[PDB]
Amino acid sequence: GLSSEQQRAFLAVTQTPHPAHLITGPAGTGKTTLLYALQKFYKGRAVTLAPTGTAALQARGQTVHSFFRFPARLLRYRHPEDIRPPGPHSPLRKAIECMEVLILDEVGMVRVDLLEAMDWALRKTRKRLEEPFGGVKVLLLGDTRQLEPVVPGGEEALYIARTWGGPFFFQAHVWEEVALRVHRLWESQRQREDPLFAELLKRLRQGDPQALETLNRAAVRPDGGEEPGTLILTPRRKEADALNLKRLEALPGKPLEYQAQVKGEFAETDFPTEAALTLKKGAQVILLRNDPLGEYFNGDLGWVEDLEAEALAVRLKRNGRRVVIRPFVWEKIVYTYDSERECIKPQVVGTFRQVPVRLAWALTVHKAQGLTLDKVHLELGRGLFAHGQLYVALTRVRRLQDLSLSRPIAPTELLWRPEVEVFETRIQEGIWQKSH
Numbered sequence: 001g002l003s004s005e006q007q008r009a010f011l012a013v014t015q016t017p018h019p020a021h022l023i024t025g026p027a028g029t030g031k032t033t034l035l036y037a038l039q040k041f042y043k044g045r046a047v048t049l050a051p052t053g054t055a056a057l058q059a060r061g062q063t064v065h066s067f068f069r070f071p072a073r074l075l076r077y078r079h080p081e082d083i084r085p086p087g088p089h090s091p092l093r094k095a096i097e098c099m100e101v102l103i104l105d106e107v108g109m110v111r112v113d114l115l116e117a118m119d120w121a122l123r124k125t126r127k128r129l130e131e132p133f134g135g136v137k138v139l140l141l142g143d144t145r146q147l148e149p150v151v152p153g154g155e156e157a158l159y160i161a162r163t164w165g166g167p168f169f170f171q172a173h174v175w176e177e178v179a180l181r182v183h184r185l186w187e188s189q190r191q192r193e194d195p196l197f198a199e200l201l202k203r204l205r206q207g208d209p210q211a212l213e214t215l216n217r218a219a220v221r222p223d224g225g226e227e228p229g230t231l232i233l234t235p236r237r238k239e240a241d242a243l244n245l246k247r248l249e250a251l252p253g254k255p256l257e258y259q260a261q262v263k264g265e266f267a268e269t270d271f272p273t274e275a276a277l278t279l280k281k282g283a284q285v286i287l288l289r290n291d292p293l294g295e296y297f298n299g300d301l302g303w304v305e306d307l308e309a310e311a312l313a314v315r316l317k318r319n320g321r322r323v324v325i326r327p328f329v330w331e332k333i334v335y336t337y338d339s340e341r342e343c344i345k346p347q348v349v350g351t352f353r354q355v356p357v358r359l360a361w362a363l364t365v366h367k368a369q370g371l372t373l374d375k376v377h378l379e380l381g382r383g384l385f386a387h388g389q390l391y392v393a394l395t396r397v398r399r400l401q402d403l404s405l406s407r408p409i410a411p412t413e414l415l416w417r418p419e420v421e422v423f424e425t426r427i428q429e430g431i432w433q434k435s436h
Contacts, residue, residue, distance in 0.1 A: 006034045009183045014041060019133060022107065022140040022432070025185025027370025028393075029290070029297060035059060035141065039103060044343050046410040047335045051109045053270040059105040062334045064114060068092070068121050074156045075113040077163050077173075078120045085125040094337040095344050098126055099136060107140040110169045111149040113160065119174045132178040140169075140180070144424065146369060146392060148417070166419045172249040175434035182427045192372070194399040205391055205416040215400070216408040224404035225362075225377035229317075231301070232362040233393060234379045237436050243362035243379075253281040256307040261355035263351035266332050273358040279304055285314060286339075287325070300369045301360055312355065326354040365393045373397055380407035388415045 002010060013021045025031055038061065039048050056063045065072065069092065075082045085094035102122075104110065119133050126134035131354035149167040151157050164171045170180075186193075203211035225232040234240040248255075260275035272288055279285070287300040303315035305321065315321045332350030337343065358367075362379075373396050384390055390413040397403045416424075426432055 002033065002037050003030070005185075005188070006030065006037065009185070010037065010103065012183060013139060013181075017135040018179070018181060019131075019135065020140075020175075020180040021138070021146075022144070022180050022182045022427075023185065024144050024182060024427070026143050026188070027146070028299070030188060031168065031185075031370070032058075032290075032298075035103070035105060038139065042101050042103075044345075045099055046103060046345060047095070047099060048103040048105065050105045051111075052106070053267055054272075055106040055109065055262060057270055057330060057332065060331075060333055061103070061105065064104075064110070064118065065109075067335060068112070068118065070117055070121075074159060075117040076112065076159070077113070077116055083117050083124070085121065085122050089278075091337055093125055093405070094342075095335060096122060096134075096336075097213065098343040099405070101139060102133065102142045103139045104141060106142040106146070106270055108142045108144050108146045109149060111151075111160075111167050112164045112169055112172045115169045115172045116164075116174060119172070122398065132174050144427075145372075145395070145420075147420065148387070166417075168419055168423070170423050170434065171298070171419065173434070175432070180430055180432045182430060184428070189372075189398075192398045197398065197400050200400065201391070201394060204394070204414045205388070206421065207302065207411060207415040209411060212409065213409050215394075216405070218400055219403055219405045220408050221377075221404045222406055223377075225379075225406075227375065227377075227404075230375045230377050230404070231360065231368075231373055232379060233364055233365055233368055233376050233396060234362055235384050235390070235393065237366060237382070239379060240362040240364050241359075244359040247361045247374075248280055248283060248359065249276070251280040251282045253307075256278050258355055261351070261353035263353065264348075265350035266330075266352050270332070272330060273350060273354060273356070275352075275354065277354065277358070279307055279312065281305065281307055283359065284361045285357045286363070287314075287357060289328050289356035291323065291325075296325065309401045312357070314357070325355060325357060327354055329353045365396070366395055371396065373402070375402045375404075377404040378406060380409070381407065382407075385410055385413035387417055388413065388420075390414055391416065 036331055048059055049064045049067055050056040050059050050061050051064050053063055122134035122136050123129040151167050160167055161261040200211055232243055255278045258277040281304050283304040285302055287296055290298045300316055300318060302316045305313035305315050311324050311326050313324045330352040331348045333346050334349045336347045337346055338345040376396055378393055
């Protein structure tokens with residue numbers, strides 16, 4: 001059931017002998033379906049991997065490190081102490097040998113050393129140490145702007161600056177070996193972008209002072225989160241929980257804890273929502289899963305109406321008072337070999353069972369990714385300017401008129417890294433290729 005926009009990328013990618021294919025575009029519905037259609041079209045010959053546990057869970061996939069058994073440290077270039085090929089008859093060698101396509105969701109968060117580890121791992125264990133990725137067709141995925149990989153500093157930062165010159169996945173020497181066909185997106189709603197707001201964001205990333213002054217002298221409205229329909233986006237989840245709790249205590253109703261059923265292997269950090277989820281009638285909440293019938297969608301803001309042991313009523317803001325949601329089951333999937341005929345089967349190894357809803361008076365940019373929001377209000381933390389970490393926060397709205405700020409933004413908070421600014425431009429022709 002793919003649309004022409006998705007079917008344009010699918011047929012362009014799924015049919016060519018070319019291995020490398022980046023696909024950029026915002027998160028959300030339509031992109032998730034595109035991945036599901038891709039992984040199932042390939043189903044027996046392809047693995048869906050992701051850099052983090054959260055990214056792996058929401059993509060029906062396995063962590064990059066957990067699949068390749070990579071250790072949790074700096075992956076030194078082609079180093080066997082770090083990159084260890086699975087030996088003969090290993091449960092891993094069999095799967096990578098009979099694979100043809102590899103998928104990488106949220107490539108934006110893949111640190112350069114990790115992409116280079118993927119290549120040298122597929123090469124040494126597939127006998128194609130001359131062709132990039134051992135000749136496996138790699139399908140990179142994710143809005144590349146959703147950055148940036150943490151680099152601890154000291155020795156590790158120095159080694160990365162010397163070997164690659166930066167942490168981003170494009171700085172990996174594998175691209176001096178093959179061309180990366182980039183399949184463009186972001187036309188999913190042309191003018192619910194407000195092209196003057198779109199251009200304003202481009203000026204802000206390029207460090208224009210007048211654009212920031214224009215941004216601040218339209219948007220700075222201290223505590224404009226009280227205004228009706230406002231979602232209060234915070235950068236750190238610590239203050240978002242505090243803001244949700246302060247408003248949950250205000251409600252007079254009787255709370256009702258919801259207890260997860262964490263079966264099997266399921267990390268604590270990978271928990272989509274609080275496993276100790278206390279709710280009250282009248283709470284602002286948001287959905288975390290697409291309804292199989294079709295009534296509700298992943299990221300549908302609502303309010304608690306009736307609390308029941310294993311069901312709850314939510315007034316959807318979108319239309320109103322229609323759906324009661326029942327607990328959903330998350331699976332922690334890991335790809336393994338099965339001698340069914342010779343080849344890959346996505347074995348379930350864990351579970352997190354609870355109601356797909358979370359407190360949404362306030363939210364983090366971490367979780368708010370790819371949501372078409374109506375009115376937001378950012379809460380500044382005096383220093384979030386970790387080389388443009390706040391640019392993603394502004395993109396959460398279509399028009400400047402919708403966004404409010406608690407405090408004016410410094411020019412640094414939005415400035416793009418030089419490596420990134422030059423990457424997102426040479427991609428807009430099509431193919432991207434590392435020079436010199």
